Amino acid sequence: GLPVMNTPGSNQFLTSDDYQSPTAMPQFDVTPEMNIPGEVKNLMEIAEVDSVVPVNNVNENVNSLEAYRIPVHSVTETGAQVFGFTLQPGADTVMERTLLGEILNYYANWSGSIKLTFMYCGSAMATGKFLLAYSPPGAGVPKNRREAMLGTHIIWDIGLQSSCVLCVPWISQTHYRFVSKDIYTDAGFITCWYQTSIVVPAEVQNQSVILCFVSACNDFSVRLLRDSPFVRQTAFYQ
Amino acid sequence: GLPVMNTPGSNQFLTSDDYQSPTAMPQFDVTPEMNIPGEVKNLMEIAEVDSVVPVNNVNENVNSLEAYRIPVHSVTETGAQVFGFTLQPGADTVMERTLLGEILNYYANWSGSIKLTFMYCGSAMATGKFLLAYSPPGAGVPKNRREAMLGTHIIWDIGLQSSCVLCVPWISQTHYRFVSKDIYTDAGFITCWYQTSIVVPAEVQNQSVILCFVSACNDFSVRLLRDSPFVRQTAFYQ
Amino acid sequence: SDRVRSITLGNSTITTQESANVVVGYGVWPDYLSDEEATAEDQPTQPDVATCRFYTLDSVSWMKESQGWWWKFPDALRDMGLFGQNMQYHYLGRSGYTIHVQCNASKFHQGCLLVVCVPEAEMGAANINEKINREHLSNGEVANTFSGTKSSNTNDVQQAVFNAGMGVAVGNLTIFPHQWINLRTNNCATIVMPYINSVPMDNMFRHYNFTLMIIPFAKLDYAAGSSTYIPITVTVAPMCAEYNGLRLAGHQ
Amino acid sequence: GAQVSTQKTGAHEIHYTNINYYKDAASNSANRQDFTQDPGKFTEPVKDIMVKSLPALN
Amino acid sequence: GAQVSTQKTGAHEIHYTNINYYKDAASNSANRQDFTQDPGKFTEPVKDIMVKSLPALN
Amino acid sequence: GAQVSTQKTGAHEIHYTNINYYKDAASNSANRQDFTQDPGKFTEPVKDIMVKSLPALN
Amino acid sequence: VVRVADTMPSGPSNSESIPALTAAETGHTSQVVPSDTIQTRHVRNFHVRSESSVENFLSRSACVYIVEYKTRDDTPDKMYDSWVINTRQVAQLRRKLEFFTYVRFDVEVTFVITSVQDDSTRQNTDTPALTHQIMYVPPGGPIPQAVDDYNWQTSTNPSVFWTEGNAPPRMSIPFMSVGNAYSNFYDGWSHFSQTGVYGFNTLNNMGKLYFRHVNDKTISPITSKVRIYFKPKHVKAWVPRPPRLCEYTHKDNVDFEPKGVTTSRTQLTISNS
Amino acid sequence: VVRVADTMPSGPSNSESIPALTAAETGHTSQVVPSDTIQTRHVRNFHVRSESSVENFLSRSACVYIVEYKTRDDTPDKMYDSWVINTRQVAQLRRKLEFFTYVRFDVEVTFVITSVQDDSTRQNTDTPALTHQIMYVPPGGPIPQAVDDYNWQTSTNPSVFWTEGNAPPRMSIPFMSVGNAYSNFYDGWSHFSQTGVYGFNTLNNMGKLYFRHVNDKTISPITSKVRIYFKPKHVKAWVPRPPRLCEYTHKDNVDFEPKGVTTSRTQLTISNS
């Protein structure tokens, strides 16, 4: 024979195996392969596509299409907070159900930069400027516009170009973050602000709708697999 | 198949294994490596660093910082024994808790030369000479100064250079010693002696403090691992 | 000879005539973050003149019976100039240090100190299951003090000179950058400590990087006519400082 | 009939053995070293491609 | 894909076989033949290095 | 890393395989092919060696 | 060896080039690197998108259906137990496969069997090792009708014999779809008059499994439970889709009840509260 | 192949070169070879510092936590048993790892399971082979709540099945710290207002294990005890520190009671007594 002795690890089944198992029906004439358009070889090609964030999720607007509309209108003086939300792609109540939020809910440790994109869906005659900030933590949430412009911001105007890009850079101690809600890794606090009001001429409606999109930059990454907390079943589906 | 037969030794777990086991989470994107200063690749780099020996451990001075002070003062005639201790790095009551004593308490069979270093922490105007002997066994412990200078000694003076080095050489039958207390391998008997007294001028205090340091030379070695006798627990730490 | 040493950092210069040496950490000189270890992506601010300079902390006295002192050192410089401001307004900070400790005495005095710069000196509490307050591990430039006996106060750090707070053997506490201010030869002690941490750029309020411990072994013994009050003065200076993530003020 | 390729290890800090045993391709191990990607058909799904400097449908 | 290196034997009185099987580096065996050391950053942690013949801060 | 040597067989009427597996020398097999001898220090333990023809301390 | 993109350095700029302004009204996803908003430094980033590939994401063993059957009872249908082969009865493996519209994967099946002794008067038996038979049956094959029926003979069909006390069985299955890809979604009927069933069920056609105890009528019934773990590999997937929001209802359709799109905030603007 | 340093020969000397006099007041550790105090001969020393390397010193299997759980009881929490993953509950492995401040090691885990039959009226059973499931759970994963709860399915999580009568299981774990090194010491808080918990505990974040019996409700309870043996390898360690003198108290802090620095002599000067 051949002198061999087993190791601790023999006769066990593991989920992440990569061991060659025999076929049950040999010499199987496999049907040919077809060039189908739209091939995915990495889920990161899917995660970097724009998709709409349900921002307005306030007390039963989620049972409707109303949750995607961010309302904005003419103010009295200036400088108010339209919307604002924490940056937790996987543990938020805002970007929880967006495509980036779903894919990161299948993961645990992520890194990389996140793009937001803001289509303006108002009338063709109204203008207005909006401060789109990013405040890294250590301090709280900036309560007025003067505290908001001491972070990474952008001053966006409404013209022919209806959509902006706030490209949130990567400012972090560690390389990777956590998806789950925890204290050691907090990210930043998006807060949108009136740079000016909305000046609109006569015979046009006053209020309008801003949308928000989300995607990932060139250096986005995910590290650990797990199960997502969205699967809530009781019995089998007979 | 393949003709193989097991040997006595199959299906056992051993503490000192070196056998390749499969991973549980494959293709794991390992976080990068960082150049941290102060890298240890051998514990012998740690064991050859000077560290202070608690010499004065006499009847509740160990519950204080008093145990590190070796007192010394002006004598009447000459030639008295300030301190003295056995050379058992791991089985002594003097060098038991020093860093060399801790590392050798994680080992069993050691060899190599040991340095002592004696900082003098007296005043800036007092002088005095001290005989720092080493008496290999076979005979007892030298009771006066005339019996003490028939070993490996050094005559150390106090001047600008406040610290001495008694570099104890390697005089042994076997290559290696034992850490534990036994009879077959005994090492030597350090005994410090007044070569002269301490002459100090007026308006200065009489008594002073000598310190002791310990380290290892270029050819120091340890051979067998074991558990150290310092770990004394009862239950788990919930 | 090499007893006269000068150090120039910005607009503050220490000249000593009875120094010993300069212990450069674990051999590594301070340096800015090279981009093989880069984690964050926005441009950091490197002041280099208004930050890399000597800041003097409070001075403490050393009687015959004093037991020790400890300073946390990303925290004791909380409110020392633009190092304090650029600590406050940012989120991640990386800096080396340069410790200098003045303490002088005449030739008719004796005694010996021990200046050890221990990284990550996590201290045990006085009671076993009690939460330490923030105002007992540090007090800024106000020095804490060891107690030689078994300290048993509430919400207090375990003060014992024969444990060094961490429960280690205090004679074995010389593995770190250490110098001995023996009062018969030396006027001061210099430790150039580089930034040792497991993350490349860390915050400077949540984290206590290290602890400077001065513990007297040989007590300040002297005659009945000499000057009693012999102070101890400590003055450090950051090196290669940079700051990442500017945000609104405060810490919470 | 051996094949030698590099293991998966991190940057800044191998050559395993693979022998194909069974007589099919459904027994071959999982090809878990395909790192290739191209986000050119989920982003930029367009004719008249943008420049990112021109005003992009001016 | 074989690697041959010397066994650990004493002085004055080998060539084993090592084949890397699994597809990672966390499965590689323990590198228990690193004898390298340098006590230059725990002893001599200093500027203006000593000579051992000069009186060493005279 | 193979070693080939002859088996033990009688006169007038092989080449086995040996691969050294474990990382030490205390795991190497028993060297049971050392046939060397020299009875020169148990016989003839002498100065002024005999000839067997001379009368051998005449 | 493929890295992620690094960060290029930038500086103070005053240009007519506008990375911030784009036209999202064309469906083009904007491509702004963080080196075009603020002054980013040089970052040599060594992240590798390794454990996010379509091979690495789906090649994990997942349960599909538990099968329970005893070794002696009063009725012949509570002895052996069958199962029609489908992946759409557990929401985890199904939800991971429903990112895509069409996939092409080989299946590597692993069975995990546990035996529970039932309660009776005479439980103190000397029971030998149990034996299990798992006979694959292609679509249209013979129907086993008992534990002693002569259709269990496997003159051609794939089978596997296991004895309790070993490693679990494992076999591979090649690509068996008659088209070119396993259709996780088919929008159509079965009859060409646009009638019949609506699925999603017209294109299952996978065959069915069977389980029985090879041992005879024991003197004590033993409840056997076998778990099937599919493990796909060599995976190519096309034309993706967003994941499912609402919970599942059945296996032969896609029907549901409406769910709110997320959980509410009760505020809209963040502050220090 | 690296030897220790040899001994060079020396002779009678009368020099101004003083190896004996050094300045320990600078922190420089003196470097006196024994060839500079007395007349040492030529020694060709063949000691190799082999079994004192940081790899050789820590790569031994050490227990961390015993886990006890039965196969049938009255309460559902005495069946399966969980454990939060930490190395700081047994003083031997903890004290060997607390030479250093930061370490970087891969973990190679080995479980050792023993089954003790409990006392009851009906201990004379014919019990088949037991089966064990050890499901790793990453931080934030689902919480198993019973021995029959459907969270034990392992659609993604690492698991291992063992049957009593074989070699013990073994799996490896790569470097899972989110920083660059497992911090055995962290001097800081959790909240940025320097409040919250003080640790040493803010940076554990390792996940937790789970244990259960795969077999059903047996007719006799069997006390199961599983021992976890960590075995690090590929070890790099930085910036050391002296070992711990005082005994340990808990796992989530460093708190203690003061201990005398050694054991007393009751004399100070040795003699023939």
PDB file of C-alpha atoms in Angstrom, chain A residues 105-231:
ATOM      1  CA  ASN A 105     -26.619  44.156   2.938  1.00  0.00           C
ATOM      2  CA  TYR A 106     -25.206  41.003   1.399  1.00  0.00           C
ATOM      3  CA  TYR A 107     -21.780  42.110   2.690  1.00  0.00           C
ATOM      4  CA  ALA A 108     -20.090  43.146   5.925  1.00  0.00           C
ATOM      5  CA  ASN A 109     -16.894  45.165   5.305  1.00  0.00           C
ATOM      6  CA  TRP A 110     -16.890  47.765   2.545  1.00  0.00           C
ATOM      7  CA  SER A 111     -14.763  50.676   1.352  1.00  0.00           C
ATOM      8  CA  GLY A 112     -14.620  53.228  -1.432  1.00  0.00           C
ATOM      9  CA  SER A 113     -16.278  56.418  -2.584  1.00  0.00           C
ATOM     10  CA  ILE A 114     -19.995  57.013  -3.125  1.00  0.00           C
ATOM     11  CA  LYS A 115     -21.571  59.305  -5.710  1.00  0.00           C
ATOM     12  CA  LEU A 116     -24.850  61.114  -5.237  1.00  0.00           C
ATOM     13  CA  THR A 117     -26.636  62.618  -8.232  1.00  0.00           C
ATOM     14  CA  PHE A 118     -29.461  65.143  -7.923  1.00  0.00           C
ATOM     15  CA  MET A 119     -31.877  65.570 -10.806  1.00  0.00           C
ATOM     16  CA  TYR A 120     -33.990  68.718 -10.521  1.00  0.00           C
ATOM     17  CA  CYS A 121     -37.535  68.099 -11.775  1.00  0.00           C
ATOM     18  CA  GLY A 122     -39.033  71.568 -11.405  1.00  0.00           C
ATOM     19  CA  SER A 123     -40.300  73.942 -14.042  1.00  0.00           C
ATOM     20  CA  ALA A 124     -38.282  75.327 -16.942  1.00  0.00           C
ATOM     21  CA  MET A 125     -38.277  78.908 -15.632  1.00  0.00           C
ATOM     22  CA  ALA A 126     -37.356  78.692 -11.929  1.00  0.00           C
ATOM     23  CA  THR A 127     -33.805  78.897 -10.593  1.00  0.00           C
ATOM     24  CA  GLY A 128     -32.089  78.319  -7.276  1.00  0.00           C
ATOM     25  CA  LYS A 129     -28.795  77.235  -5.719  1.00  0.00           C
ATOM     26  CA  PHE A 130     -28.308  74.441  -3.200  1.00  0.00           C
ATOM     27  CA  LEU A 131     -25.419  73.697  -0.833  1.00  0.00           C
ATOM     28  CA  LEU A 132     -24.758  69.937  -0.808  1.00  0.00           C
ATOM     29  CA  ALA A 133     -22.443  69.292   2.145  1.00  0.00           C
ATOM     30  CA  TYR A 134     -20.670  66.329   3.724  1.00  0.00           C
ATOM     31  CA  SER A 135     -19.673  66.582   7.375  1.00  0.00           C
ATOM     32  CA  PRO A 136     -17.296  63.895   8.657  1.00  0.00           C
ATOM     33  CA  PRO A 137     -18.010  62.837  12.254  1.00  0.00           C
ATOM     34  CA  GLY A 138     -16.348  63.747  15.521  1.00  0.00           C
ATOM     35  CA  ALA A 139     -18.661  66.717  15.668  1.00  0.00           C
ATOM     36  CA  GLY A 140     -22.430  66.429  15.598  1.00  0.00           C
ATOM     37  CA  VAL A 141     -24.876  67.391  12.853  1.00  0.00           C
ATOM     38  CA  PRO A 142     -24.531  71.013  11.629  1.00  0.00           C
ATOM     39  CA  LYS A 143     -27.666  72.845  12.679  1.00  0.00           C
ATOM     40  CA  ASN A 144     -27.449  75.935  10.439  1.00  0.00           C
ATOM     41  CA  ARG A 145     -25.897  76.792   7.080  1.00  0.00           C
ATOM     42  CA  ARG A 146     -22.844  78.464   8.647  1.00  0.00           C
ATOM     43  CA  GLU A 147     -21.885  75.204  10.348  1.00  0.00           C
ATOM     44  CA  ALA A 148     -22.659  73.248   7.180  1.00  0.00           C
ATOM     45  CA  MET A 149     -20.157  74.882   4.814  1.00  0.00           C
ATOM     46  CA  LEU A 150     -17.147  73.864   6.941  1.00  0.00           C
ATOM     47  CA  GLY A 151     -17.189  70.405   5.369  1.00  0.00           C
ATOM     48  CA  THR A 152     -16.778  68.924   1.930  1.00  0.00           C
ATOM     49  CA  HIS A 153     -19.525  70.742   0.055  1.00  0.00           C
ATOM     50  CA  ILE A 154     -20.572  71.822  -3.432  1.00  0.00           C
ATOM     51  CA  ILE A 155     -22.614  74.799  -4.615  1.00  0.00           C
ATOM     52  CA  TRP A 156     -24.967  73.601  -7.333  1.00  0.00           C
ATOM     53  CA  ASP A 157     -26.887  75.821  -9.757  1.00  0.00           C
ATOM     54  CA  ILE A 158     -29.980  74.976 -11.794  1.00  0.00           C
ATOM     55  CA  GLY A 159     -29.801  75.731 -15.503  1.00  0.00           C
ATOM     56  CA  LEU A 160     -29.707  73.624 -18.643  1.00  0.00           C
ATOM     57  CA  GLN A 161     -27.791  70.985 -16.679  1.00  0.00           C
ATOM     58  CA  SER A 162     -30.556  69.602 -14.488  1.00  0.00           C
ATOM     59  CA  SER A 163     -28.460  67.100 -12.509  1.00  0.00           C
ATOM     60  CA  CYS A 164     -25.493  67.583 -10.179  1.00  0.00           C
ATOM     61  CA  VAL A 165     -22.836  65.252  -8.801  1.00  0.00           C
ATOM     62  CA  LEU A 166     -21.644  65.388  -5.204  1.00  0.00           C
ATOM     63  CA  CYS A 167     -18.765  62.912  -5.282  1.00  0.00           C
ATOM     64  CA  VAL A 168     -18.131  62.073  -1.626  1.00  0.00           C
ATOM     65  CA  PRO A 169     -14.404  61.319  -1.242  1.00  0.00           C
ATOM     66  CA  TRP A 170     -12.821  58.799   1.086  1.00  0.00           C
ATOM     67  CA  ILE A 171     -11.741  60.210   4.451  1.00  0.00           C
ATOM     68  CA  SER A 172     -11.290  57.389   6.934  1.00  0.00           C
ATOM     69  CA  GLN A 173      -9.016  56.017   9.616  1.00  0.00           C
ATOM     70  CA  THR A 174      -9.302  52.371   8.628  1.00  0.00           C
ATOM     71  CA  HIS A 175      -9.319  50.989   5.123  1.00  0.00           C
ATOM     72  CA  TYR A 176     -12.715  49.285   5.487  1.00  0.00           C
ATOM     73  CA  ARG A 177     -15.985  50.142   7.219  1.00  0.00           C
ATOM     74  CA  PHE A 178     -18.806  48.062   8.656  1.00  0.00           C
ATOM     75  CA  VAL A 179     -22.247  47.592   7.159  1.00  0.00           C
ATOM     76  CA  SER A 180     -23.966  47.007  10.506  1.00  0.00           C
ATOM     77  CA  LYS A 181     -24.907  49.734  12.960  1.00  0.00           C
ATOM     78  CA  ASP A 182     -22.000  50.291  15.343  1.00  0.00           C
ATOM     79  CA  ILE A 183     -20.165  53.077  17.129  1.00  0.00           C
ATOM     80  CA  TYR A 184     -16.476  52.639  16.170  1.00  0.00           C
ATOM     81  CA  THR A 185     -17.017  53.428  12.459  1.00  0.00           C
ATOM     82  CA  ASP A 186     -19.265  56.371  11.628  1.00  0.00           C
ATOM     83  CA  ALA A 187     -19.119  57.966   8.196  1.00  0.00           C
ATOM     84  CA  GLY A 188     -20.648  61.381   7.603  1.00  0.00           C
ATOM     85  CA  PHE A 189     -23.829  63.407   7.605  1.00  0.00           C
ATOM     86  CA  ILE A 190     -25.272  64.625   4.302  1.00  0.00           C
ATOM     87  CA  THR A 191     -27.197  67.852   4.763  1.00  0.00           C
ATOM     88  CA  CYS A 192     -28.701  69.887   1.925  1.00  0.00           C
ATOM     89  CA  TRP A 193     -29.216  73.616   2.305  1.00  0.00           C
ATOM     90  CA  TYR A 194     -30.719  76.563   0.457  1.00  0.00           C
ATOM     91  CA  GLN A 195     -27.891  78.647  -0.925  1.00  0.00           C
ATOM     92  CA  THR A 196     -30.656  80.875  -2.285  1.00  0.00           C
ATOM     93  CA  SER A 197     -34.419  80.414  -2.452  1.00  0.00           C
ATOM     94  CA  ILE A 198     -36.453  79.386  -5.507  1.00  0.00           C
ATOM     95  CA  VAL A 199     -37.307  82.415  -7.643  1.00  0.00           C
ATOM     96  CA  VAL A 200     -40.172  81.525  -9.977  1.00  0.00           C
ATOM     97  CA  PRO A 201     -42.153  83.887 -12.257  1.00  0.00           C
ATOM     98  CA  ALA A 202     -45.920  84.221 -12.412  1.00  0.00           C
ATOM     99  CA  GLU A 203     -48.419  81.583 -13.624  1.00  0.00           C
ATOM    100  CA  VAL A 204     -46.109  78.740 -12.546  1.00  0.00           C
ATOM    101  CA  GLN A 205     -46.558  76.496  -9.515  1.00  0.00           C
ATOM    102  CA  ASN A 206     -44.432  77.256  -6.480  1.00  0.00           C
ATOM    103  CA  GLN A 207     -43.375  73.803  -5.257  1.00  0.00           C
ATOM    104  CA  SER A 208     -41.228  71.303  -7.135  1.00  0.00           C
ATOM    105  CA  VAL A 209     -39.527  67.891  -6.779  1.00  0.00           C
ATOM    106  CA  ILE A 210     -35.810  67.064  -6.435  1.00  0.00           C
ATOM    107  CA  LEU A 211     -34.707  63.460  -6.926  1.00  0.00           C
ATOM    108  CA  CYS A 212     -31.610  61.693  -5.608  1.00  0.00           C
ATOM    109  CA  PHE A 213     -29.487  58.980  -7.211  1.00  0.00           C
ATOM    110  CA  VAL A 214     -26.695  56.854  -5.738  1.00  0.00           C
ATOM    111  CA  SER A 215     -23.814  54.803  -7.161  1.00  0.00           C
ATOM    112  CA  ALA A 216     -20.179  53.926  -6.462  1.00  0.00           C
ATOM    113  CA  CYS A 217     -16.863  55.272  -7.726  1.00  0.00           C
ATOM    114  CA  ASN A 218     -13.930  53.454  -9.310  1.00  0.00           C
ATOM    115  CA  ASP A 219     -12.432  52.168  -6.032  1.00  0.00           C
ATOM    116  CA  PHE A 220     -15.436  50.678  -4.262  1.00  0.00           C
ATOM    117  CA  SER A 221     -15.048  47.316  -2.541  1.00  0.00           C
ATOM    118  CA  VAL A 222     -16.783  44.725  -0.346  1.00  0.00           C
ATOM    119  CA  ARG A 223     -15.060  42.037   1.687  1.00  0.00           C
ATOM    120  CA  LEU A 224     -17.090  39.523   3.788  1.00  0.00           C
ATOM    121  CA  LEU A 225     -20.140  37.524   2.727  1.00  0.00           C
ATOM    122  CA  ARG A 226     -23.068  36.870   5.080  1.00  0.00           C
ATOM    123  CA  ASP A 227     -26.841  36.558   4.974  1.00  0.00           C
ATOM    124  CA  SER A 228     -28.856  39.721   4.556  1.00  0.00           C
ATOM    125  CA  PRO A 229     -31.284  40.738   7.344  1.00  0.00           C
ATOM    126  CA  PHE A 230     -34.193  41.102   4.886  1.00  0.00           C
ATOM    127  CA  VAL A 231     -35.130  37.417   4.497  1.00  0.00           C
TER     128      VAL A 231
END
